[PDB]
Write a protein that binds this ligand. Structure first.
Ligand SMILES: OC[C@H]1O[C@@H](O[C@H]2[C@H](O)[C@@H](O)[C@H](O[C@H]3[C@H](O)[C@@H](O)[C@H](O[C@H]4[C@H](O)[C@@H](O)[C@H](O)O[C@@H]4CO)O[C@@H]3CO)O[C@@H]2CO)[C@H](O)[C@@H](O)[C@@H]1O
Ligand SMILES: *[C@@H]1O[C@H](CO)[C@@H](O)[C@H](O)[C@H]1NC(C)=O
Ligand SMILES: [Cl-]
Ligand SMILES: [Cl-]
Ligand SMILES: [Cu+2]
Length: 235
């Protein structure tokens, strides 16, 4: 259980974004139904009033939280990978529009999952804004918790992979548009019961053998890291 509070741009806190520039759900319950429109931007996908100004090459930092900002972020049980997708706001998340900018499953070195390092990062992870057409975008941050992903939701609806999905409203002002955004995958649609990384046993199988769900990170991506960029406590 976890949600996005707001974003930092080049280490500058953009302030509380909930229901403002984040399409926030009413709570931190996971999404589990792979076929649900809830897979797009969570249970309450609607245009919210603001879109954060950025330029190509900016560092965009998502900040997640559990109950209060900068608390314990997400339960230590929720081991899994972190992905960030972009789509043109045009789409409102519909159709084959989601392009991956970032993937992080397991760091062999440190022996930590992305979720472990997100907790350490006080809920902060970042992507470098790509050189796409200036305009309005959704950035979809996705945490997959696998603590029950040994089952499929479709077979056993009290277990299954859990998706913590947050769509940020981002307006890209300055960019040379040197990497125009290609068509992408649909959500719902890209994840099915057979897709790798959806069904996996973190209790029996080694984390080095884990293989995150496709698609692959777009070559136009400039991402990206899991690490604190600024102190929320200084406000
Ligand atoms: O640990 C391995 C073990 O995990 C089992 O799954 C556990 C999770 O480990 C545990 O973290 C999880 O905790 C949930 C709890 O179910 C929720 O009800 C609770 O929801 C809170 C929320 O946190 C608050 O932020 C919000 O305000 O209110 C709601 C109250 O409804 O959130 C926590 C996570 O923070 O519970 C699981 C039990 O299924 C696996 O089942 C097992 O297979 C593993 O071996
Ligand atoms: C999953 O979502 C689809 C599409 O909204 C729906 O038809 C189906 O009933 C859902 N599954 C469950 C268990 O509710
Ligand atoms: Cl849970
Ligand atoms: Cl540029
Ligand atoms: Cu949870």
């Amino acid at each position: 259980h976890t949600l996005v509070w707001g974003v930092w741009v080049n280490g500058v806190d953009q302030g509380d974004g909930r229901n403002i520039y984040i399409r926030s759900p009413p709570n931190n319950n996971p999404v589990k139904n792979l076929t649900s429109p809830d897979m797009t931007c969570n249970v309450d996908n609607r245009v919210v009033p603001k879109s954060v100004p950025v330029n190509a090459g900016d560092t965009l930092t998502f900040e997640w939280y559990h109950n209060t900002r900068d608390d314990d972020i997400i339960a230590s049980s929720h081991h899994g990978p972190i992905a960030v997708y972009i789509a043109p706001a045009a789409s409102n998340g519909q159709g084959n529009v989601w392009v991956k900018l970032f993937e992080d499953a397991y760091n062999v070195t440190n022996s930590t999952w992305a979720v472990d390092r997100l907790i350490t990062a006080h809920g902060q992870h970042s992507v470098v804004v790509p050189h796409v057409a200036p305009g309005d975008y959704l950035f979809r941050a996705e945490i997959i918790a696998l603590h029950e992903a040994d089952s499929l939701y479709s077979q056993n609806p009290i277990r299954g992979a859990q998706f913590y999905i947050s769509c940020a409203q981002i307006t890209i002002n300055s960019s040379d548009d040197s990497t125009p955004l290609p068509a992408g995958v649909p959500f719902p649609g890209a994840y099915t019961d057979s897709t790798p990384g959806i069904q996996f046993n973190i209790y029996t199988t080694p984390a080095t053998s884990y293989v995150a769900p496709p698609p692959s990170v777009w070559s136009g991506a400039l991402g990206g890291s899991i690490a604190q960029v600024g102190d929320a406590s200084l406000e």
